[PDB]
Amino acid sequence: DEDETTALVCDNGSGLVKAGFAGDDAPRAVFPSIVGRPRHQGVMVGMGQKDSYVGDEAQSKRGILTLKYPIEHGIITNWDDMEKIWHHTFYNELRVAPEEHPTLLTEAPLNPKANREKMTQIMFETFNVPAMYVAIQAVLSLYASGRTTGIVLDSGDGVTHNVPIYEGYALPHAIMRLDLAGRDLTDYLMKILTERGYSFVTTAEREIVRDIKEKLCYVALDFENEMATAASSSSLEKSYELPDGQVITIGNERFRCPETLFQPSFIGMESAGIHETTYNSIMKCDIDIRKDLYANNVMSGGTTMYPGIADRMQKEITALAPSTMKIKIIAPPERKYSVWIGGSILASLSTFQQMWITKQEYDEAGPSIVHRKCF
Amino acid sequence: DEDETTALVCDNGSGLVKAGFAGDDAPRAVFPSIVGRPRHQGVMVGMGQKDSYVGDEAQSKRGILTLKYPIEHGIITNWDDMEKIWHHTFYNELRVAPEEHPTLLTEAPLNPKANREKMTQIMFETFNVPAMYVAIQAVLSLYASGRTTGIVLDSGDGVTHNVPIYEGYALPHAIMRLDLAGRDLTDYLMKILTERGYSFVTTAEREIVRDIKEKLCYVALDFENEMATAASSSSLEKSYELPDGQVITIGNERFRCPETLFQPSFIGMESAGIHETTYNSIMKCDIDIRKDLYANNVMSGGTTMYPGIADRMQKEITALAPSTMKIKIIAPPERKYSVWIGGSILASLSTFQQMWITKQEYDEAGPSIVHRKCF
Amino acid sequence: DEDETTALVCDNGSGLVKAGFAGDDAPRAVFPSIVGRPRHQGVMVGMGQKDSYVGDEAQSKRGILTLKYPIEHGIITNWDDMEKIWHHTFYNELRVAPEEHPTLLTEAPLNPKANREKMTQIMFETFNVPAMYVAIQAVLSLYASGRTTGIVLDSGDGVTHNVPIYEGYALPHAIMRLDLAGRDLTDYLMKILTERGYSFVTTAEREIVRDIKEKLCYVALDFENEMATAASSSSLEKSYELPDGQVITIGNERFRCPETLFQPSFIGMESAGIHETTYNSIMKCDIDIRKDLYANNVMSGGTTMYPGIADRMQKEITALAPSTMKIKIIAPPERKYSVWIGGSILASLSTFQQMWITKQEYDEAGPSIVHRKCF
Amino acid sequence: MQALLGARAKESLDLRAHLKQVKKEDTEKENREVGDWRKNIDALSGMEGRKKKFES
Amino acid sequence: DESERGMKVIESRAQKDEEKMEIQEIQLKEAKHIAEDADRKYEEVARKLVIIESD
Ligand SMILES: Nc1ncnc2c1ncn2[C@@H]1O[C@H](COP(=O)(O)OP(=O)(O)O)[C@@H](O)[C@H]1O
Ligand SMILES: Nc1ncnc2c1ncn2[C@@H]1O[C@H](COP(=O)(O)OP(=O)(O)O)[C@@H](O)[C@H]1O
Ligand SMILES: Nc1ncnc2c1ncn2[C@@H]1O[C@H](COP(=O)(O)OP(=O)(O)O)[C@@H](O)[C@H]1O
């Protein structure tokens, strides 16, 4: 498949792992961070079957499997399951592996340090990677976006980081990390769809409601006006096809789920929302920085695919921001993929070739080396 | 005819329906949630015989009836049959027409909206009740228990609710509503008794099994030690007398059926079980609210009468819970009847007289008013 | 409850309010500068529950409250919440009616003017106090310490004032107010604990991190040598009990957080630290002043209780100071409270009874009068 | 030094007493539905002969 | 239940006293720590008093 020892890049979240090789501007394939296991007793023999299923296998045979996610809020809690997902990712589907390629991982600036230590150990001892680097997701978003400055809202599956970067430098005192992400938005949606008579509890059901959110939901520029009509008229409803031929018809729930980004109180979180959070990352920086961060609100990660997000965010920040000042938002089509893409860019940059931890330095220092060599 | 126009109180479950008047400590009567219909051709004339039977009539004449339950997993799917039940419950048996008294009904806080709306609609439009208020079942359990803080786990016939309440406030993001209940335990017992040589499939057979469960079954606080002996020796079996003089004995199956509340996989359900949902209702709340929820696990509803359930629900939580912390189960005699009793308590509070939907506000707004006025 | 018509003393910071009567050596009670409000939906009727909680009430019910602090970086902005805290402070716990007693309040001289104006206005217009006086925390610290001369570092919750006083005179050109205080050290610790895997974001969690700092942290005499071993071994770690039975174990973070006092860059501040401010307050004074200020560096307020701080500060200043000269620190056991005591001393001095704004002069001039009458 | 333990033990007692008093007031105020009934029988001791029905 | 309520007041009292005891135990180790530390400091300063007085 490949004729060069290009670095490999993997963006591993509580949703899916985006993966491919450096030099591309997209992952080659997406690998759901899922390990599936049968929840039923087998009766027939000569049926093939797996002890455990991963990624797309886990989703394809999900009718009788319970599906578990090894990553919680950016932390791998079950790395034995991640090794199986990674083995499949590398050797079966991407047809590349760390064994013959250096590997770049994507992470948040405040991701618990022990998590990088374990991923570092796995790629060096299980997959025999010749070298490693763990990069900041905000950096990767800025490279993909054509910027050196901005507030990056990396919208992960289990956590949003929110870190300001100026002239290529971190401004860590203004990080406003929030425990709200795409997976929590799904929880709100399933609770309100439960109120309508469509409970989502078991694995197949959990996957369906996630799929409903991704295809039907939006934020809109004005929640209250959107609701005044959506709560009053069937013209704002959409019927989603469930796997068995039945449908679910969804009204203002279509936007109330996404709205948790602006209203975290919807899921019990003590927060004013992502626009306030973005505002504080800008406002807590020095006034000669603020102008450049107001001009560079960078949306990245997932949930940014919701219609109206660019307008909802720019308008709320403008309202919070001082007058005269111009507030601008970056929301490129390289959305949801921009962290992976930035990983490709960074791994391949000539300026980054000396930033790699080799599998020399690794064994002399051990896995904790990532804490000194990467960030 | 009554001394005062206090509310009529009625708890409509998927199992039993209970009613009495506000201010007393017991319902006057308990009925199964059943409307019965003949499944045979009549041959004798002038035998009386109704086209349909309600409540205890349906169960008393069941020998030739097929019996249906209008409520499933906490909601009314057949309002016409509930109309028959309410007429019988309130007017034929308590001897009070709802027309002259407020009526207090109940539903879980995450109970699908259509049900709280339909209960409001029928009592106002077919019974002309002057006022309505549909109570939160967890609240009523707390009123009957004498608690403001705790996890209300109501393990009834329909649905297990699992809701954390602190100082009279709900923590809705931590409610683990679960579709695992007493009705499933009854059907599981019909199937396991079939395995023992005593098949049960028909309505009469289901009513026998529900009677067997209610008199012979238990949970066992330590089921592994209990089954090691119960599955090995007849000394642990208990005899039950069937309506026709037959005797059935049950051994480890006697507790294995209730065990499903901890082991949901026995009925094909994907769940952690009631002890883990209690744990998560506590654990998903803020740390200054869990120290009180751990010390206040509030048991309510039916199925709570199985010996070993309170100790089995405290041991499992203790095992999941952090050390040092005190875990305590509250399991009062007002079990299974605690929601009705709490209903009586709520109805008689002076502060509750401002919570009623009047039959004015109802017609101006329609049944959707239940979400504006009740919860 | 009280036996004298004495002055009242209340030292109101962004953290806590220390209140009692003039002539004592301690506040009668310490009330956190907090007004709490429920952030959850109520479900039980007739079980009390307040709309808001004040001071110690706010912390006692904090499990479901969002807690707001009326004072920021040394000044009062939420004057309404201050009046409520004071009403509670004076009438419920100090058991006094300010209408019958003159009152002394405090601030830092380099805080914005509005603070002293609003504090004066509340006591004259909502409490009808017969007289008012806003004091200098440094003055009060020198009275409490038995000095007329020295550099006072008052360690606020909001800001650190850093003022040289000689023979009872201000030397204002040499004040080095620093935007580093206990709330910034707390924020730093929340971020460093995130690196260790413990996320603290909600009010209850934020209050815990403050409590962790208070019980586990120190500055160390020699940071680099202390970190060399703290970063290498568990022998310098301490475990803190979280109020749910779980624990958090903290290592070099235990001192890296307080180290911000010597290295403000840790929170994004441009400053060389508290020893630089002490030094420059001495250095910017005339050489016939400097000898007395070098010999009288005064520690007041919190942070002065950290192990290594009195010895570290004396070492850090003597290192910048000329040789021959004696550099000395005053750090009495009346730590974190000596400023209150100074309030008591000043409020009760005969030399101070002509310094009061009376409720005649105030009514004629309005609150701007505090600028002419106090300092 | 003991002022708060007194106040805290009391707050717990006042709340517990409140909650118990509320359920006790209804328990004691009305108690008929919580009792029982005669549930008498027919016997037919006056059945000295057959009935007027063709079926008797 | 009344006996438990009585018991809970006295169990709570035992707990209030256990808590006070523990607080007081901490205050004792600290009050005594200070008694000792103040004496440790007494000797450090008193030793300086002697050295300085000798000087
Ligand atoms: N239309 C959409 N609506 C809501 N969420 C979306 C949409 N498109 C993408 N996302 C979210 O993108 C996430 C996966 O991409 P991403 O989070 O950027 O990788 P990573 O979590 O490693 O950072 C999923 O949570 C997915 O639901
Ligand atoms: N003796 C008993 N032993 C075990 N379970 C019982 C017993 N009595 C009642 N339960 C069970 O409790 C369920 C009744 O649910 P319930 O909580 O009373 O609904 P509701 O809140 O409307 O009253 C039924 O499945 C019934 O079999
Ligand atoms: N054990 C401790 N070690 C060092 N500092 C402490 C300790 N305990 C409390 N403090 C600090 O004391 C501060 C309150 O002291 P204080 O000086 O009286 O505030 P203020 O100047 O506003 O009056 C708290 O914010 C806390 O950070």
Side-chain angles (χ1 to χ4, degrees):
Chain A
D1 293 87
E2 300 292 333
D3 57 349
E4 181 59 292
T5 58
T6 184
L8 304 180
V9 179
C10 300
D11 186 9
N12 295 281
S14 61
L16 60 80
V17 180
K18 292 191 170 81
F21 61 90
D24 221 309
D25 205 47
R28 175 155 202 227
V30 296
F31 300 91
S33 297
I34 301 172
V35 179
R37 293 180 172 88
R39 69 185 185 88
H40 290 271
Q41 173 66 55
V43 296
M44 300 185 78
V45 299
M47 297 294 102
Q49 304 300 304
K50 305 294 185 182
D51 57 315
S52 64
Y53 298 80
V54 299
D56 54 303
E57 293 176 335
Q59 290 176 319
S60 292
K61 300 299 192 186
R62 68 187 179 273
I64 58 168
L65 307 178
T66 178
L67 301 183
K68 304 295 186 181
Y69 292 80
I71 298 168
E72 295 183 356
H73 308 290
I75 297 96
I76 298 167
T77 63
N78 184 328
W79 44 86
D80 291 342
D81 283 351
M82 289 304 299
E83 288 181 354
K84 290 189 284 292
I85 292 166
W86 283 329
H87 185 81
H88 175 72
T89 296
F90 292 138
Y91 294 95
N92 293 336
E93 295 292 316
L94 296 175
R95 305 289 183 79
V96 294
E99 183 177 358
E100 297 183 357
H101 298 269
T103 300
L104 184 148
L105 302 175
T106 66
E107 293 294 354
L110 294 171
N111 189 275
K113 70 182 183 180
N115 192 45
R116 289 185 287 154
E117 185 176 5
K118 182 57 64 178
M119 293 177 81
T120 298
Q121 183 172 43
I122 293 167
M123 293 298 171
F124 282 112
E125 297 180 31
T126 298
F127 297 102
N128 296 313
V129 72
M132 295 186 76
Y133 188 82
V134 181
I136 298 297
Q137 289 174 310
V139 168
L140 300 181
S141 293
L142 290 171
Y143 283 120
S145 298
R147 295 291 185 275
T148 62
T149 300
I151 306 300
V152 180
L153 286 87
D154 58 359
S155 298
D157 189 78
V159 63
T160 301
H161 182 62
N162 304 312
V163 53
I165 298 172
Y166 178 81
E167 293 284 314
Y169 302 72
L171 302 173
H173 70 286
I175 294 168
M176 302 291 150
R177 185 180 64 81
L178 175 65
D179 291 339
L180 175 62
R183 174 82 48 187
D184 296 301
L185 298 179
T186 300
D187 180 62
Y188 189 75
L189 181 60
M190 71 179 76
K191 287 184 168 75
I192 64 177
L193 295 178
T194 297
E195 289 184 350
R196 288 172 69 93
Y198 293 79
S199 297
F200 297 88
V201 178
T202 66
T203 296
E205 293 170 350
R206 291 202 298 275
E207 292 294 299
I208 293 166
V209 66
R210 178 184 58 76
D211 195 66
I212 291 168
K213 181 186 79 188
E214 291 177 7
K215 292 185 175 73
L216 274 69
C217 291
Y218 63 94
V219 296
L221 68 90
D222 182 328
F223 177 79
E224 292 77 10
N225 287 338
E226 188 69 17
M227 186 170 279
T229 300
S232 298
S233 177
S234 66
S235 67
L236 274 284
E237 291 183 336
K238 173 71 176 176
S239 297
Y240 171 93
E241 181 180 348
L242 301 170
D244 61 355
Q246 295 187 92
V247 299
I248 182 168
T249 300
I250 302 173
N252 66 27
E253 299 85 6
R254 192 172 178 192
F255 53 91
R256 288 164 62 187
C257 163
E259 188 65 13
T260 299
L261 290 173
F262 295 91
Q263 297 289 339
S265 68
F266 281 15
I267 60 168
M269 177 65 207
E270 188 185 351
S271 174
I274 63 169
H275 57 293
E276 186 71 24
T277 300
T278 300
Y279 169 69
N280 286 333
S281 291
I282 296 167
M283 200 67 180
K284 298 295 185 181
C285 295
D286 290 349
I287 65 288
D288 287 322
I289 296 171
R290 287 179 196 178
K291 75 185 198 296
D292 295 288
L293 295 174
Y294 278 117
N296 294 282
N297 182 16
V298 178
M299 304 301 293
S300 190
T303 79
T304 58
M305 284 232 192
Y306 286 135
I309 195 66
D311 295 293
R312 186 60 203 277
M313 287 294 288
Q314 185 178 26
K315 290 178 184 293
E316 288 293 347
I317 294 167
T318 300
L320 295 171
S323 66
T324 301
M325 181 61 71
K326 303 296 185 182
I327 294 84
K328 299 180 183 180
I329 186 162
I330 295 96
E334 288 80 19
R335 33 207 197 177
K336 106 214 234 191
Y337 298 93
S338 66
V339 172
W340 183 90
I341 293 167
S344 179
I345 293 167
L346 179 59
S348 67
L349 292 177
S350 65
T351 61
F352 183 74
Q353 297 305 304
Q354 299 300 311
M355 292 295 289
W356 286 97
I357 299 168
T358 65
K359 190 176 190 296
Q360 180 64 48
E361 290 171 312
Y362 171 80
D363 289 305
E364 291 174 2
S368 67
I369 191 167
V370 71
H371 298 157
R372 281 98 74 187
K373 294 291 189 178
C374 295
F375 62 89
Chain B
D1 296 297
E2 294 292 322
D3 289 346
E4 180 59 292
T5 56
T6 66
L8 298 176
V9 179
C10 182
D11 183 11
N12 305 301
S14 69
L16 303 173
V17 180
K18 300 191 300 296
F21 66 91
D24 206 323
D25 202 33
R28 173 63 185 82
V30 53
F31 307 94
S33 298
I34 298 173
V35 177
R37 293 179 172 87
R39 69 184 186 87
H40 290 267
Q41 174 66 56
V43 295
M44 300 185 76
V45 298
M47 298 292 103
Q49 305 303 310
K50 296 176 178 173
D51 54 291
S52 62
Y53 296 83
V54 59
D56 55 305
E57 293 178 340
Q59 189 178 54
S60 294
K61 298 293 185 179
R62 69 186 180 273
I64 49 74
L65 305 176
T66 180
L67 303 182
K68 304 295 183 183
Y69 289 79
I71 297 170
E72 181 176 356
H73 296 296
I75 61 170
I76 299 167
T77 63
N78 184 328
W79 68 267
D80 188 75
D81 286 346
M82 286 304 300
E83 182 169 351
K84 290 179 179 65
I85 291 168
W86 286 328
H87 181 75
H88 183 67
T89 298
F90 293 121
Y91 182 75
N92 290 341
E93 294 285 307
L94 301 181
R95 312 300 296 172
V96 180
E99 183 177 1
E100 295 178 354
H101 290 253
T103 299
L104 181 64
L105 301 179
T106 37
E107 51 92 66
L110 300 179
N111 189 272
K113 287 171 75 177
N115 186 53
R116 67 185 77 180
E117 291 174 352
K118 185 60 65 179
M119 287 189 286
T120 300
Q121 181 172 42
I122 299 303
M123 293 307 298
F124 282 118
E125 296 182 26
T126 65
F127 293 98
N128 297 311
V129 70
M132 288 291 289
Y133 192 90
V134 181
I136 299 168
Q137 288 171 312
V139 169
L140 299 186
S141 294
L142 290 171
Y143 279 138
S145 296
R147 303 285 168 162
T148 58
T149 299
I151 306 301
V152 179
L153 195 151
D154 56 350
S155 293
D157 191 80
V159 65
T160 299
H161 200 61
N162 300 301
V163 54
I165 300 172
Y166 183 84
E167 293 287 327
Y169 290 81
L171 289 316
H173 66 283
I175 297 169
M176 300 297 107
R177 184 170 67 75
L178 174 65
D179 294 327
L180 178 63
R183 186 176 292 181
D184 296 303
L185 297 178
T186 299
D187 287 342
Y188 184 72
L189 184 61
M190 291 172 75
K191 290 180 181 178
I192 205 166
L193 296 178
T194 299
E195 290 180 352
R196 291 182 66 76
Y198 294 79
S199 295
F200 297 91
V201 297
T202 67
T203 294
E205 289 172 339
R206 184 171 287 105
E207 293 299 303
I208 292 168
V209 173
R210 56 157 320 168
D211 195 66
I212 292 168
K213 183 186 79 174
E214 291 172 7
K215 293 183 174 73
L216 274 68
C217 289
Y218 67 100
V219 173
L221 71 90
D222 184 326
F223 77 94
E224 290 180 346
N225 288 337
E226 191 69 14
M227 75 187 288
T229 300
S232 297
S233 177
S234 66
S235 67
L236 271 284
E237 292 184 347
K238 178 72 178 178
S239 297
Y240 173 87
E241 180 185 342
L242 279 82
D244 58 357
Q246 292 182 74
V247 177
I248 186 167
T249 65
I250 305 172
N252 58 298
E253 304 88 353
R254 188 175 167 202
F255 61 89
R256 186 174 175 87
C257 294
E259 183 183 336
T260 301
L261 293 173
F262 298 87
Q263 298 293 309
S265 67
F266 292 178
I267 59 169
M269 179 65 191
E270 182 184 350
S271 175
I274 70 96
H275 58 292
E276 186 166 352
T277 58
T278 302
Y279 171 72
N280 284 330
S281 292
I282 296 166
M283 202 67 179
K284 298 293 184 181
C285 296
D286 290 348
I287 65 288
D288 286 316
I289 295 161
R290 287 194 221 141
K291 80 168 200 305
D292 296 291
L293 296 175
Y294 277 117
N296 294 274
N297 294 312
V298 178
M299 181 174 280
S300 187
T303 79
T304 53
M305 290 206 208
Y306 289 127
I309 188 65
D311 300 296
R312 177 67 186 279
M313 98 158 305
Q314 186 179 287
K315 182 179 178 184
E316 290 288 357
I317 294 165
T318 300
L320 294 171
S323 66
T324 300
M325 181 60 70
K326 173 67 178 178
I327 296 89
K328 170 71 177 175
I329 189 69
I330 301 164
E334 290 80 3
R335 30 206 202 178
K336 120 200 238 181
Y337 298 91
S338 62
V339 173
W340 186 90
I341 292 166
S344 180
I345 293 167
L346 177 60
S348 70
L349 295 174
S350 67
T351 56
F352 182 66
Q353 305 310 310
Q354 300 301 310
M355 295 296 289
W356 291 106
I357 298 166
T358 65
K359 190 177 190 299
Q360 180 64 47
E361 290 173 311
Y362 173 79
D363 291 304
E364 292 175 2
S368 67
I369 193 166
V370 70
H371 194 63
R372 293 180 179 87
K373 298 290 186 175
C374 296
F375 187 72
Chain C
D1 293 300
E2 298 291 357
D3 57 339
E4 182 60 294
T5 58
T6 186
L8 305 176
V9 179
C10 302
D11 186 21
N12 298 274
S14 67
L16 301 99
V17 179
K18 298 186 289 295
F21 66 89
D24 206 332
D25 62 335
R28 289 290 307 277
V30 179
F31 304 84
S33 295
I34 301 172
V35 178
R37 294 180 173 88
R39 71 185 186 88
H40 297 92
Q41 174 67 56
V43 296
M44 303 187 75
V45 177
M47 307 278 104
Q49 304 305 314
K50 296 175 179 171
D51 54 290
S52 63
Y53 296 79
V54 178
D56 52 304
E57 291 178 339
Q59 289 178 323
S60 293
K61 259 72 179 177
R62 68 187 180 273
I64 58 169
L65 307 177
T66 180
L67 302 183
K68 304 296 184 183
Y69 291 84
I71 298 167
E72 296 183 354
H73 298 292
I75 64 170
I76 183 68
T77 62
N78 188 336
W79 76 268
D80 186 65
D81 286 348
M82 174 176 266
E83 188 273 333
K84 289 188 284 294
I85 292 167
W86 285 351
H87 189 80
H88 174 67
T89 296
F90 290 123
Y91 289 90
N92 292 332
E93 292 295 332
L94 270 57
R95 301 288 179 86
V96 298
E99 184 178 3
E100 297 181 2
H101 304 277
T103 300
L104 184 150
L105 304 176
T106 66
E107 68 175 17
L110 294 181
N111 287 142
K113 286 166 68 173
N115 185 60
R116 63 170 74 185
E117 291 175 351
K118 295 301 290 183
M119 289 191 296
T120 299
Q121 182 172 45
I122 293 167
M123 291 305 297
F124 282 115
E125 297 182 29
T126 66
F127 292 90
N128 297 313
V129 71
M132 292 294 290
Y133 187 85
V134 179
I136 298 168
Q137 289 173 313
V139 168
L140 298 182
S141 295
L142 289 171
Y143 281 115
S145 293
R147 295 291 185 275
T148 62
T149 300
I151 307 299
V152 180
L153 285 87
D154 55 0
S155 296
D157 300 299
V159 298
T160 300
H161 184 67
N162 300 302
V163 57
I165 299 171
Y166 179 82
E167 293 283 318
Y169 288 80
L171 303 172
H173 64 284
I175 298 167
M176 301 292 148
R177 183 174 65 75
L178 176 65
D179 287 337
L180 175 62
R183 293 281 291 277
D184 296 300
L185 295 177
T186 300
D187 189 71
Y188 186 74
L189 184 62
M190 290 189 280
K191 289 180 173 64
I192 206 166
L193 296 178
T194 299
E195 290 179 350
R196 284 177 75 86
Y198 292 75
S199 172
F200 296 91
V201 297
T202 67
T203 294
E205 292 172 336
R206 292 194 296 273
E207 291 291 295
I208 292 167
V209 172
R210 175 183 56 75
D211 196 71
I212 292 168
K213 183 176 76 70
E214 292 173 357
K215 292 184 175 72
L216 274 66
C217 289
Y218 65 99
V219 296
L221 182 58
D222 182 327
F223 176 79
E224 292 76 10
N225 287 339
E226 191 71 18
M227 188 174 180
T229 61
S232 297
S233 178
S234 66
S235 66
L236 279 82
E237 291 183 335
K238 182 169 169 68
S239 298
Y240 174 90
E241 180 180 348
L242 300 169
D244 65 0
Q246 297 185 99
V247 299
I248 183 167
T249 300
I250 301 169
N252 63 25
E253 301 85 4
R254 190 173 174 198
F255 50 98
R256 286 161 64 197
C257 294
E259 181 65 12
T260 301
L261 292 172
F262 296 95
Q263 296 182 64
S265 67
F266 287 7
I267 60 167
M269 179 64 197
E270 184 188 354
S271 175
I274 62 169
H275 57 293
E276 181 69 24
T277 61
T278 301
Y279 180 74
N280 288 335
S281 291
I282 297 167
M283 184 185 77
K284 297 294 187 181
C285 297
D286 289 349
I287 67 290
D288 286 321
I289 296 171
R290 289 181 181 181
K291 74 185 199 297
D292 296 293
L293 295 175
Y294 276 119
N296 296 280
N297 288 313
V298 178
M299 299 294 104
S300 179
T303 79
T304 62
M305 292 177 72
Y306 285 129
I309 194 66
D311 295 298
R312 170 129 193 217
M313 285 292 285
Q314 188 172 289
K315 182 176 182 291
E316 290 291 358
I317 283 76
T318 195
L320 299 175
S323 69
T324 302
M325 178 58 69
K326 173 66 178 177
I327 294 86
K328 182 176 178 180
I329 294 175
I330 299 168
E334 304 209 320
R335 299 259 236 311
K336 139 191 235 179
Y337 292 92
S338 67
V339 70
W340 184 87
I341 293 168
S344 180
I345 293 167
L346 178 58
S348 63
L349 297 178
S350 66
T351 66
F352 178 71
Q353 301 306 310
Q354 301 302 310
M355 293 297 291
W356 291 110
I357 300 166
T358 66
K359 188 179 187 298
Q360 181 65 49
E361 290 173 313
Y362 176 85
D363 287 347
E364 292 173 4
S368 67
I369 193 167
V370 70
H371 189 67
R372 293 192 300 275
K373 294 289 186 176
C374 294
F375 63 92
Chain D
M1 75 188 178
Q2 296 178 341
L4 295 173
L5 73 91
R8 289 171 180 164
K10 183 176 185 289
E11 183 178 1
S12 179
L13 182 61
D14 287 347
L15 178 59
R16 288 186 284 110
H18 176 71
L19 295 171
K20 290 185 178 186
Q21 184 64 23
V22 171
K23 69 181 184 178
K24 288 180 181 181
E25 287 174 354
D26 291 301
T27 299
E28 293 181 350
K29 184 177 179 180
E30 297 283 342
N31 62 347
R32 183 69 186 87
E33 292 178 334
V34 76
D36 208 337
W37 295 265
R38 175 65 185 84
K39 302 173 191 172
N40 212 331
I41 58 88
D42 50 1
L44 304 178
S45 66
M47 180 177 173
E48 294 181 357
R50 68 184 293 268
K51 296 181 180 179
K52 69 182 182 181
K53 292 181 77 176
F54 298 116
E55 296 176 11
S56 178
Chain E
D1 291 344
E2 181 62 23
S3 293
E4 288 190 359
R5 284 189 287 270
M7 187 185 78
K8 292 296 178 184
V9 172
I10 61 171
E11 186 178 0
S12 294
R13 185 171 69 83
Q15 291 167 354
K16 299 296 183 181
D17 289 340
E18 289 165 358
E19 290 168 353
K20 299 296 183 181
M21 178 190 73
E22 290 169 353
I23 291 165
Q24 289 173 341
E25 188 176 59
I26 292 166
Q27 290 169 336
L28 173 57
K29 78 181 178 70
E30 292 298 314
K32 189 71 186 298
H33 181 78
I34 299 300
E36 293 175 4
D37 198 64
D39 282 342
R40 272 192 292 274
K41 287 183 167 65
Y42 174 88
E43 290 299 323
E44 290 168 351
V45 43
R47 181 167 62 252
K48 289 175 184 177
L49 178 60
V50 172
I51 292 166
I52 298 302
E53 186 173 6
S54 180
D55 289 347

